[PDB]
Design a protein around this ligand. Sequence first.
Ligand SMILES: CCCCCCCCCCCCCCCCCC(=O)O
Ligand code: NA
Length: 122
Amino acid sequence: DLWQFGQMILKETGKLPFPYYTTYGCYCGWGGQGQPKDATNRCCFVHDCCYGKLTGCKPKTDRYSYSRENGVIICGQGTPCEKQICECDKAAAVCFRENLGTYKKRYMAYPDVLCKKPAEGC
Ligand SMILES: CCCCCCCCCCCCCCCCCC(=O)O
Ligand code: NA
């Protein structure tokens, strides 16, 4: 669920998920518009697409099992929805960590007027 995704983000990046990954670029936030502005933004875009594939699941409310061992997130046993949601969340959290080097404070609260057409497609 979103509480768990938030904890993953904090564990992987050392940043609180709000505001650092809720108001960044064009896609780190609710949905998005336009094209991803950098690597971190593309992680958010991919995560949105990942959730999009889970048509029969409720990714923001379904709580799943996971652990984090030798610095690796391990999605635990569960329903197919729980497992797939966990894997979407893990991938995005790791993606954020891997692109912290290019995280730009400039892109927090990125003006929605610059998230211009054409939209990137999943
Ligand atoms: C007045 C309201 C203040 C704002 C609300 C504060 C509470 C926010 C709780 C955050 C929990 C985890 C949020 C997960 C964010 C996911 C980001 C993303 O889509 O990449
Ligand atoms: Na988004």
